Ligand binder design. Structure first.
Ligand SMILES: N[C@@H](Cc1cc(I)c(Oc2cc(I)c(O)c(I)c2)c(I)c1)C(=O)O
Ligand SMILES: [F-]
Ligand code: NA
Length: 372
């Protein structure tokens, strides 16, 4: 039940956070894992008390009258268990960790609870050595992501006390892989009104769920992975990116779920990779997480020691889109005449990667320029 309520709330948080990012960095690539951020902040909240705690979950979009705190905590336990369960043909792990200055001692019950509930690991770190601390954090993340997310954290100020990190590991195959013999190099991709970049353009004629949204002035194309997950490509009409961004919400996803229809599409999709790195504090504080960052932070559920507060919450997300899926691997031959409409993704678009069993947003972003 809680898992069901969480989907809409987590999606609205995703889009609200996305909009915060557009105002921090206008007209630049955006790419992050909403569900991983949500889960990490619920974990952090598990060690917080009073307003420090309620600020976090309310900023995530929850109403404590509707979903009591313990229900949220257990709903996210169930979510992580579900997403991270081993599945054939899909690797999916969301995860997080805390790095805490060595002078502060976490409560053993907290450590054991968050490992059990959320798979979280917690490390004692000497933040007086900034380069060493960054390497420790980044090595942890690189190992947890089987090497895919490298250099997640880039900046730490002196007097760092606690760092939250969150990440996602994702490996998947398209239900309908592209034939690499049809991939065209150096196709033109508009990164703004007048500027083009050259990108390889994959090409497949197949049946896809898609729609033309007359209200929001965009075309939506659904491409399934072979297990659990799917991609939505959101292609705004000329000059309509801003109106699309403003409209994205859990209500919009519900509308599209109903209106998507299947048919033949002569489809052209760029082959590319995207990444982005964030220090989330700026946005999260604006969105309402204040006490956790202050000298009055109440982390009594985390430690009996005085002086614990959040210093930084860091996140990096990366994804490849290629002929097979997420991996640069061969497409076996076995796995591959009326006039059909063309959808050509040759200009800036929004991208969602969704997980079906839990209705989580694994990745959300805007591809302004696919050639980083
Ligand atoms: N129809 C197919 C394909 C599909 C899956 C998902 I996941 C999705 O994204 C959401 C996200 C939220 I949040 C919702 O409340 C709803 I309804 C759909 C959409 I669009 C389409 C299915 O379900 O397998
Ligand atoms: F196939
Ligand atoms: Na296949």
């Amino acid at each position: 039940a809680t898992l069901y309520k969480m989907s809409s709330i987590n999606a609205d948080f995703a889009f609200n956070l996305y909009r915060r990012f557009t105002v921090e960095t206008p007209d630049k690539n955006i790419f992050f894992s909403p569900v991983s951020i949500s889960a990490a902040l619920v974990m952090l909240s598990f060690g917080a008390c009073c307003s420090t705690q309620t600020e976090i979950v309310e900023t995530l979009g929850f109403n404590l009258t509707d979903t009591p705190m313990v229900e949220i905590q257990h709903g996210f336990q169930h979510l992580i268990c579900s997403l991270n369960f081993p599945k054939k043909e899909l690797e999916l792990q969301i995860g997080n960790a805390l790095f805490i200055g060595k002078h502060l001692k976490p409560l053993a019950k907290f450590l054991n609870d968050v490992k059990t509930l959320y798979e979280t690991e917690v490390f004692s770190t000497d933040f007086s050595n900034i380069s060493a601390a960054k390497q420790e954090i980044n090595s942890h993340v690189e190992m947890q992501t089987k090497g895919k997310v490298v250099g997640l954290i880039q900046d730490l100020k002196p007097n760092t006390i606690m760092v939250l990190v969150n990440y996602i590991h994702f490996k998947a195959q398209w239900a309908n892989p592209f034939d690499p013999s049809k991939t065209e190099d150096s196709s033109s991709f508009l990164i703004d009104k007048t500027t083009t970049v050259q990108v390889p353009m994959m090409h497949q004629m197949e049946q896809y769920y898609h729609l033309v949204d007359m209200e929001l002035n965009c075309t939506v194309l659904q491409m399934d992975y072979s297990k659990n997950a799917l991609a939505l490509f959101v292609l705004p009409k000329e000059g309509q990116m801003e109106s699309v961004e403003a409209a994205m919400s859990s209500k919009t996803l519900k509308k599209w779920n109903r209106l998507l229809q299947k048919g033949w599409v002569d489809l052209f999709v760029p082959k590319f990779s995207i990444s982005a790195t964030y220090d989330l504090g700026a946005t999260l504080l604006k969105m309402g997480i204040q006490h956790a960052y202050s000298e009055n932070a109440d982390f009594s559920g985390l430690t009996e020691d005085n002086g614990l507060k959040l210093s930084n919450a860091a996140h990096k997300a990366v994804l490849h889109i290629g002929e097979k899926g997420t991996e640069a691997a061969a497409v076996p031959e076995v796995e591959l005449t009326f006039l059909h409409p063309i959808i050509q993704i040759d200009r800036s678009f929004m991208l969602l990667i969704l997980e079906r069993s839990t209705r989580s947003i694994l990745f959300l972003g805007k591809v302004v320029n696919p050639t980083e």
